[PDB]
Amino acid sequence: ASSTNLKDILADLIPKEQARIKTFRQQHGNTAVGQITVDMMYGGMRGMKGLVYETSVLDPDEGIRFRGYSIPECQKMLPKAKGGEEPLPEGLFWLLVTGQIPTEEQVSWLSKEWAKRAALPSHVVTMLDNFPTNLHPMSQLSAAITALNSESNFARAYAEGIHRTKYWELIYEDCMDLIAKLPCVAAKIYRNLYREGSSIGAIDSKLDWSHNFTNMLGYTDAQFTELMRLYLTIHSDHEGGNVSAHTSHLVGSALSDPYLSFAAAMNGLAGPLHGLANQEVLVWLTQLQKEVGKDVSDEKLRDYIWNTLNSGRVVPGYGHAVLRKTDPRYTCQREFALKHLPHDPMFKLVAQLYKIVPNVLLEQGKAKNPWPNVDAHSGVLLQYYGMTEMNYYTVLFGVSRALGVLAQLIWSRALGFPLERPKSMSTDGLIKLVDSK
Amino acid sequence: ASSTNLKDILADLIPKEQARIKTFRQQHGNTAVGQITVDMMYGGMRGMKGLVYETSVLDPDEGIRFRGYSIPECQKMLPKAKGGEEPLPEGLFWLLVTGQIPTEEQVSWLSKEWAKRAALPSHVVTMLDNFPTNLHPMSQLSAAITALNSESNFARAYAEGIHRTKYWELIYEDCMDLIAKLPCVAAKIYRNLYREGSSIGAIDSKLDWSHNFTNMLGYTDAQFTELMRLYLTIHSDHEGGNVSAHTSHLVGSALSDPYLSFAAAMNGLAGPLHGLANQEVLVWLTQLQKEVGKDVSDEKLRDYIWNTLNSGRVVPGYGHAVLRKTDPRYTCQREFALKHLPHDPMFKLVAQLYKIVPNVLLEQGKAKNPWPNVDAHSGVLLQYYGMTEMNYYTVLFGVSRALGVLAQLIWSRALGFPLERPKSMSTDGLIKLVDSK
Ligand SMILES: CC(C)(COP(=O)(O)OP(=O)(O)OC[C@H]1O[C@@H](n2cnc3c(N)ncnc32)[C@H](O)[C@@H]1OP(=O)(O)O)[C@H](O)C(=O)NCCC(=O)NCCS
Numbered sequence: 001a002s003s004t005n006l007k008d009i010l011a012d013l014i015p016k017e018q019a020r021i022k023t024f025r026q027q028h029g030n031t032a033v034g035q036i037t038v039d040m041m042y043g044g045m046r047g048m049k050g051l052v053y054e055t056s057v058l059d060p061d062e063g064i065r066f067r068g069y070s071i072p073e074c075q076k077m078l079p080k081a082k083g084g085e086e087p088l089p090e091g092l093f094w095l096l097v098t099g100q101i102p103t104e105e106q107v108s109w110l111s112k113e114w115a116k117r118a119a120l121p122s123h124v125v126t127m128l129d130n131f132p133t134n135l136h137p138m139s140q141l142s143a144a145i146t147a148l149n150s151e152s153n154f155a156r157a158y159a160e161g162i163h164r165t166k167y168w169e170l171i172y173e174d175c176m177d178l179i180a181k182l183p184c185v186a187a188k189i190y191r192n193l194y195r196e197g198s199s200i201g202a203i204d205s206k207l208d209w210s211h212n213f214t215n216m217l218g219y220t221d222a223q224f225t226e227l228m229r230l231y232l233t234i235h236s237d238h239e240g241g242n243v244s245a246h247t248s249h250l251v252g253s254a255l256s257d258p259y260l261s262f263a264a265a266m267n268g269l270a271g272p273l274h275g276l277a278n279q280e281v282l283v284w285l286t287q288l289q290k291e292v293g294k295d296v297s298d299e300k301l302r303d304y305i306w307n308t309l310n311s312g313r314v315v316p317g318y319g320h321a322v323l324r325k326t327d328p329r330y331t332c333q334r335e336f337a338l339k340h341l342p343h344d345p346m347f348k349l350v351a352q353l354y355k356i357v358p359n360v361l362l363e364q365g366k367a368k369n370p371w372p373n374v375d376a377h378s379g380v381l382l383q384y385y386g387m388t389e390m391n392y393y394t395v396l397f398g399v400s401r402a403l404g405v406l407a408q409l410i411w412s413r414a415l416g417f418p419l420e421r422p423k424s425m426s427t428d429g430l431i432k433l434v435d436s437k
Numbered sequence: 438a439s440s441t442n443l444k445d446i447l448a449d450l451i452p453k454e455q456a457r458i459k460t461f462r463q464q465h466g467n468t469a470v471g472q473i474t475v476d477m478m479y480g481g482m483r484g485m486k487g488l489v490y491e492t493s494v495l496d497p498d499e500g501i502r503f504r505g506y507s508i509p510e511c512q513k514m515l516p517k518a519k520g521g522e523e524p525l526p527e528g529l530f531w532l533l534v535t536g537q538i539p540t541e542e543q544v545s546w547l548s549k550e551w552a553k554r555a556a557l558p559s560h561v562v563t564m565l566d567n568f569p570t571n572l573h574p575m576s577q578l579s580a581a582i583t584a585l586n587s588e589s590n591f592a593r594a595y596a597e598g599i600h601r602t603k604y605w606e607l608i609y610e611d612c613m614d615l616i617a618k619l620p621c622v623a624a625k626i627y628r629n630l631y632r633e634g635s636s637i638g639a640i641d642s643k644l645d646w647s648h649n650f651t652n653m654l655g656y657t658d659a660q661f662t663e664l665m666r667l668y669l670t671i672h673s674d675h676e677g678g679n680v681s682a683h684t685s686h687l688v689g690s691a692l693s694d695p696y697l698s699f700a701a702a703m704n705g706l707a708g709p710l711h712g713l714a715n716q717e718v719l720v721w722l723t724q725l726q727k728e729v730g731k732d733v734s735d736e737k738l739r740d741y742i743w744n745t746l747n748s749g750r751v752v753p754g755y756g757h758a759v760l761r762k763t764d765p766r767y768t769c770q771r772e773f774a775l776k777h778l779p780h781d782p783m784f785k786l787v788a789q790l791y792k793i794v795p796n797v798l799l800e801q802g803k804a805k806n807p808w809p810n811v812d813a814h815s816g817v818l819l820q821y822y823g824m825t826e827m828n829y830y831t832v833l834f835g836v837s838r839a840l841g842v843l844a845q846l847i848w849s850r851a852l853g854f855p856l857e858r859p860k861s862m863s864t865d866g867l868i869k870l871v872d873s874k
């Protein structure tokens with residue numbers, strides 16, 4: 001019988017997995033998977049195998065895998081966009097949730113379903129309209145998404161005491177609704193702040209999520225949308241260990257609904273040391289250009305970089321807590337630029353920084369990863385198509401990141417993952433424990 | 438020379454600690470402090486020694502310690518309130534930050550300084566006023582605090598590239614400002630939602646934080662305020678392992694400012710499995726009373742409890758992820774009730790549940806901790822003094838929790854704790870790792 005629907009494919013998957021993990025655990029749960037040292041406890045779990053997080057895994061040399069699907073693999077296999085060359089973010093979502101590579105037909109369903117669900121409640125539209133213009137786009141986003149929780153189906157089934165065993169099904173509704181709304185929140189922000197007077201207009205059921213987004217942003221450039229598909233897809237997910245994913249995961253585990261847990265993830269992504277580096281790169285470049293001037297040398301270029309390190313500041317967009325090579329999401333962005341915007345001054349600068357920064361970082365002998373990460377390359381692309389308002393960039397990272405984070409949330413919950421609740425120590429107790437005892 | 442100021446006492450403390458940890462780590466950082474099993478990874482870090490968290494530590498038998506200061510110890514040593522019998526929350530804060538038991542004189546400074554800082558920006562006052570009346574108080578709180586980030590001194594010193602080494606000093610300003618504002622946010626919510634038409638009025642520099650709070654709530658009862666001091670103090674902090682503290686800690690570590698990280702902590706506290714149990718207890722009791730009727734027997738009382746367990750629901754306010762006995766914060770609440778409200782029907786019910794629940798939980802053979810936690814006893818006290826709007830209760834938990842969470846944030850940052858970034862695995866990789874490899 002019938003046609004397409006991810007929640008049924010989920011319904012079929014979940015029990016098989018539920019069984020799979022229980023055998024595995026019934027046999028291998030005792031197994032020491034690794035040890036904890038005291039440096040690990042002071043180093044922010046650096047090295048720690050903390051979680052189980054299904055929808056992707058980060059390799060220190062290779063970089064991310066979406067099943068065992070590398071970014072090059074995703075680039076060629078996922079459905080493009082019916083006259084395009086970038087993966088549709090939709091079918092990354094389907095991959096993530098389902099482990100399977102979508103069919104064209106699956107993805108139109110995703111597109112159209114996200115379009116169906118895409119509406120904003122009057123109060124969120126109110127709040128958005130009154131927000132101050134010195135309130136950071138990330139702050140605006142987060143607030144909105146916390147406010148939207150009003151409309152959580154989960155939070156309402158939970159208050160009405162459902163059976164634990166149907167949590168996922170409700171957490172799936174909210175996730176699918178969150179994802180649909182998100183570009184309406186985001187594009188309302190961009191529109192209030194930077195396009196005063198104008199409206200985000202109507203979502204068209206015949207477009208893909210990316211295109212309706214760029215339309216609501218007000219971008220007509222064909223290639224911008226393509227840039228958009230590629231952007232939203234590579235920023236999707238980055239294992240569970242990273243602050244934003246781990247936040248949602250943590251807060252999720254207390255059975256806070258999908259809006260609440262996502263907006264917590266947002267006040268993580270707005271960390272300078274996290275997704276706010278997007279922005280931070282461009283502010284840094286921009287200053288470099290002013291302060292260090294137009295067409296600098298590899299010798300002056302280094303003077304600028306040392307003036308930062310010598311100031312007890314960080315060089316944005318460089319380094320990573322797990323990758324030990326160049327981010328493939330960096331390479332992927334570089335390719336695009338080589339392809340579409342090669343003569344762009346800012347690009348040429350970012351390409352010359354790649355020549356210099358990792359050697360300066362290697363010289364300083366501090367950084368364990370002197371190589372660039374996604375954030376190093378992202379803003380230069382946006383800049384090019386007239387997206388010059390760099391304080392908003394993290395919100396795009398934010399819209400994309402929902403895809404990975406809410407894909408896992410549905411599994412977390414369909415697998416019945418507990419309250420994440422580690423143990424803590426004070427240095428005092430630590431000092432007495434390992435040595436004193 | 439001169440008079441009182443915590444930031445100088447901090448300034449003196451920090452280097453000593455900074456040195457202390459570096460020796461300790463230079464010598465004992467290698468030390469295996471514990472191991473990770475695969476059950477631990479699927480059990481939400483249950484058992485895992487994750488973090489270093491200074492301001493308190495949770496013992497599984499004894500329960501919390503604020504230095505090595507147990508709740509009974511705090512009850513007798515901390516400055517009361519110049520004609521009271523409950524610890525002033527202020528001097529719990531001083532203890533937490535400084536490790537020292539405050540002097541009366543320290544605490545008046547705290548009181549008066551918190552009063553100084555206590556103002557809300559027009560936009561937050563706007564947003565608050567427009568919020569819908571079906572938007573949960575916790576959602577309202579969180580949103581507001583994310584919105585307040587506008588006013589972060591940290592976030593502005595960071596954009597202006599300070600030296601890493603002065604982070605704490607800015608993170609101290611914001612924390613002290615957050616804590617001051619908080620009861621103005623909270624009391625504005627209570628006032629809009631439940632007291633329509635009326636205003637929170639003016640903070641008086643001669644009152645303590647607790648009293649200005651109860652005044653803004655509109656409570657005149659002397660004993661209510663005392664209840665307030667005791668409440669705000671025992672909910673302060675609960676090591677770093679718990680969702681709310683761990684959220685702020687996580688998001689904090691990305692150098693998200695103290696408002697952002699706190700409101701993330703809030704969408705954690707609004708987890709049913711976390712601080713929302715406050716509320717959940719009272720909804721459960723209230724139903725019990727309706728559904729199971731006024732003065733029930735120990736036999737019918739058990740029928741109600743089984744109808745919940747048999748429904749794949751949880752019994753609220755019972756259990757804990759680390760304590761293996763009755764929460765001392767439970768006992769402490771029970772004492773108060775014995776003292777002030779012994780004939781209260783709801784109390785008598787909560788006292789009879791203590792008789793029955795842990796035996797029903799012990800029978801079901803599921804719960805590792807069949808004993809009550811703070812949330813089991815809290816709402817019954819509020820109820821009594823006319824605070825009957827149980828959807829707000831978690832916000833009180835929320836105001837109190839800022840004290841522990843922001844005390845640690847200043848240390849985290851003055852000690853230069855890194856980005857919290859554990860490693861994740863999918864079951865797939867896990868299955869291949871321990872056994873397959
Ligand atoms: C992602 C990041 C947080 C990795 O954290 P990490 O794993 O703890 O970093 P490492 O393991 O490499 O070791 C950290 C040391 O190297 C230095 N380091 C790491 N990245 C650096 C960078 N890009 N520039 C300068 N120094 C850096 C730090 O000074 C630190 O020294 P410390 O112990 O004296 O504090 C990141 O490398 C960083 O701190 N900065 C870049 C983040 C970014 O893009 N920021 C933009 C906003 S300014």
Ligand SMILES: CC(C)(COP(=O)(O)OP(=O)(O)OC[C@H]1O[C@@H](n2cnc3c(N)ncnc32)[C@H](O)[C@@H]1OP(=O)(O)O)[C@H](O)C(=O)NCCC(=O)NCCS
Pocket residue numbers: 416418419709710711713714715717718746750751752753754755756757758759803804805806812
């Ligand atoms: C704090 C809490 C999350 C502890 O988590 P934990 O350490 O993972 O729980 P445990 O180690 O005791 O083991 C959990 C098992 O015991 C049961 N359990 C724990 N607390 C229970 C409670 N109060 N009522 C019923 N069952 C409970 C769970 O069914 C679970 O079974 P499962 O593996 O089939 O899912 C808590 O005990 C809980 O789940 N519920 C109470 C939280 C609360 O106050 N909620 C109010 C809103 S309804």
